[PDB]
Amino acid sequence: LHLPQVLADAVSRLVLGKFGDLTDNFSSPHARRKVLAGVVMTTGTDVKDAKVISVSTGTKCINGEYMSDRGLALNDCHAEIISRRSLLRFLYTQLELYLNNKDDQKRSIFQKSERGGFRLKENVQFHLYISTSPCGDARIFSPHEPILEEPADRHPNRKARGQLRTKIESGYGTIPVRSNASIQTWDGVLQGERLLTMSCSDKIARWNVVGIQGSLLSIFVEPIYFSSIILGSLYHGDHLSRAMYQRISNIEDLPPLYTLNKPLLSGISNAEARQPGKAPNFSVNWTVGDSAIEVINATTGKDELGRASRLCKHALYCRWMRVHGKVPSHLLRSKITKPNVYHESKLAAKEYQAAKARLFTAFIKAGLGAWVEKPTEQDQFSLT
RNA sequence: GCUCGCGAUGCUGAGGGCUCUG
RNA sequence: CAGAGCCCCCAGCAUCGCGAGC
Ligand SMILES: O=P(O)(O)O[C@H]1[C@H](OP(=O)(O)O)[C@@H](OP(=O)(O)O)[C@H](OP(=O)(O)O)[C@@H](OP(=O)(O)O)[C@H]1OP(=O)(O)O
Ligand SMILES: [Zn+2]
């Protein structure tokens, strides 16, 4: 695991393996998938120290009509997005773990940080797997395997390169945000405005500035970055590195601990094959500790009986509130105070919100567009 | 090298249908 | 109620050509 290609091949093997174990060795009906993703944790360089944290599948996003004003629906079921949400549940569990008694502090991946709150114990790293290239910048210009003849991008200084791009409801393509400068509205989307969702290349880039942990968790922990991003197919390195960080090397004035993370980027030795079939309309998820995968309809953002996912906003907020009650005031990384409304609680994470603003400005100043958010009303709910 | 326009050939989440299945 | 196979269809990108601008 000291070598990059060995690591890359190992994380693919592990995520795939785990996916098999959870689906009756690849023969369960939920083994059917177009894209697989997961996260792996390494705690030191032995192959045995490596552990699968999460697994997911999916290729689709929510239909506009099914947005939840209560946070009960998954908005984006592209596999790598779901795999991050699944890792958030691990992070919550590992916080609780440390918090429940002194003995358990040995186990937990967190320790107290010398600057407040919590940080990862040294040599704890997470690695992202995607069985293909993330949509947007990393994918759109060469959405096929690389060919040994002319592998290099011939027009790297085109304006299209680096652009922020959106999944577009009912539309193919990943479309520049330039061309939808209007902000999105709740009443608009419901009537038929096509719901825009930032592309996966864009979101990963964002995680390489603001951390993978989100706003809420940053109230308790320091920023966590992916150390590797491994692709099982369609690896183009010049496009991938552009997309994941290099396009915003212009970024500045990040609050302390935040940075422009530049993870290992790799393909695998033997790429995955195009999976046969119509692309399934469900997304599967699993975090370590769960007894099974959870199956979500990507169009409703719910399971087949209309029940909310363990990974929905409301579920995550519920976790954040459990953990909040066990963290003494003096151990909070932010002591700024907000009402118990999901939107408001995220604003307590001042330094995260500031990093986020630096990100949005980096993209604008580089000529790459303005980030496109959900309608204001999405996050305006409380618990119960 | 890039931008704009015109053409041409392709690439990549929905919609309508037919056939069948549970 | 749900799924599959096959047909038809629907805003970016690639390649190449034409004209122009930087
Ligand atoms: O990429 P996803 O996993 O879909 O989720 C994110 C996440 O929202 P939740 O974690 O609440 O589901 C962001 O939250 P933080 O990074 O702040 O923790 C939120 O960003 P804002 O809170 O900054 O708005 C962003 O939403 P947005 O669409 O407003 O960028 C939203 O992504 P999606 O809406 O695309 O799911
Ligand atoms: Zn995607």
- Inter-residue contact A241 to A235 (CB < 8 Å): no
Burial of A66 (0-12, 13-18, 19+ CB in 10 A): middle
CA dist., res. A229 & res. A208, Å (int): 11
Please, which residues bridge with residue A267 across strands?
A: A231
Q: Is A262 annotated as a binding residue?
A: no
Instruction: Give the Cα separation of A193 and A186 in Å (integer).
Output: 9
Q: With b meaning 16 or more CB within 10 Å and e meaning fewer, what string describes A319-330?
A: bbeebeeebeee
Q: Measuring from the CA of residue A169 to each C1' atom, give the nucleotide at the shortest distance.
A: B13
Return the structure tokens found at A64.
């506009």
% helix, strand, coil for chain A, step of 5: 35, 15, 50
Whether A106 sits with its Cβ under 7 A from any strand B atom: the answer reads no
A18, A282 Cβ separation under 8 angstroms: no
Cα separation, A350 vs A368, whole angstroms:
25
Closest protein CA for atom 17 of ligand 1: A215
- List the structure tokens of A136: 């947007």
Report chain breaks in chain A, C–N > 2.5 Å, as residues after which they occur.
none
* Cα A148 to the center of its chain, rounded Å: 31
Nearest to A119 by CA among A108, A128, A129, A111: A111
- The structure tokens 């963290």 sit at A327
Q: What is the spatial distance between Cα A294 and Cα A30, in angstroms, rounded to a whole number? A: 10
Q: What is the rounded distance in angstroms from the CA atom of residue A76 to the CA atom of residue A82?
A: 7
A310 is in an annotated binding site: no
Task: Give distance in angstroms: CA of A206 to centre of ligand 1.
Answer: 11
From the list A152, A150, A159, the residue with the least C-alpha distance to A179 is A159
Question: Please, which positions of strand B sit below 7 A from a protein CB?
Answer: 1-4, 11-15
Read off the amino acid at residue A148. L
- The tokens describing A211, both together, are 């951390």
| A90: enclosing H helix or E strand | helix A79-100
Domain ranges of chain A: 1-384
List ligand 1's pocket residues with C-beta within 6 A: A 75-76, 81, 84-85, 197-198, 203, 214-216, 313, 346, 373-374
SS3 A280: coil
Instruction: For ligand 1, atom 20, name the residue with the nearest CA.
Output: A373
Report which secondary-structure segment, H or E, holds A64.
none
Helix (H) or strand (E) holding A5: helix A4-22
Cβ atoms A76, A64 nearer than 8 A? no
The closest alpha carbon to A234, from A193, A272, A199, belongs to A272
- Measure A140 CA to C11 C1' (Å): 13
β-sheet with A226-231: strand ranges across? A264-267, A226-231, A125-130, A36-42, A51-57, A282-287, A294-297
Q: Which of A27, A85, A37, A89 is nearest to A58 (CA)?
A: A37
Rounded Cα distance, A262 and A279, in Å: 32
- Please tell me whether any atom of strand B lies within 7 Å of the Cβ of A278: no
The span from the CA of A252 to the CA of A260, in Å, is 9
| Residue A126 phi, psi dihedral angles, 5° rounding | -115, 145
* DSSP letter assigned to residue A85: H
CA A378 / ligand 1 centre spacing (Å): 10
Q: Which three-class secondary structure state does DSSP give residue A310?
A: coil
Experiment used for this model: X-ray
Q: Which ligand is nearest to the CA of A37?
A: 2
By alpha-carbon position, which residue is closest to atom 1 of ligand 1?
A81
What is the Cα–Cα distance from A300 to A168, expressed in whole angstroms? 16
Q: What is the 3-state secondary structure (H, E, C) of A136-204?
A: CCCCCCCCCCCCCCCCCCCCCCCCCCCCCEEEECCEEEEEEHHHCCCCCCHHHHHHCCCCEEECHHHHH
> What phi and psi values does residue A3 have, to the nearest 5 degrees?
-90, 145
Q: Report d(CA A231, CA A242) in Å as an integer.
A: 15
Q: How far apart are alpha carbons A267 and A137 in whole angstroms?
A: 17
* DSSP-assigned letters across all residues of A15-65: HHHHHHHHTTTTTSGGG--S-EEEEEEESSSSGGG-EEEEEEE---B--GG
Query: Please, what's the largest Cα pairwise distance for chain A?
Result: 60
- Which nucleotide has its C1' atom closest to residue A280's CA? C3
Distance separating alpha carbons of residues A61 and A174, to the nearest angstrom: 13
Task: Provide the resolution (angstroms).
Answer: 2.5
What's the CA gap between A199 and A212, in Å, rounded?
16
Question: Ligand 2 centroid vs A79 CA: distance in angstroms?
Answer: 7
Tokens of A178: 């330039």
* Residue A192 Cβ under 7 A from any strand B atom: no
Q: Does A171 contact strand C, using a CB cutoff of 7 Å?
A: yes
CA–centroid distance, A255 to ligand 1, in Å, is: 20
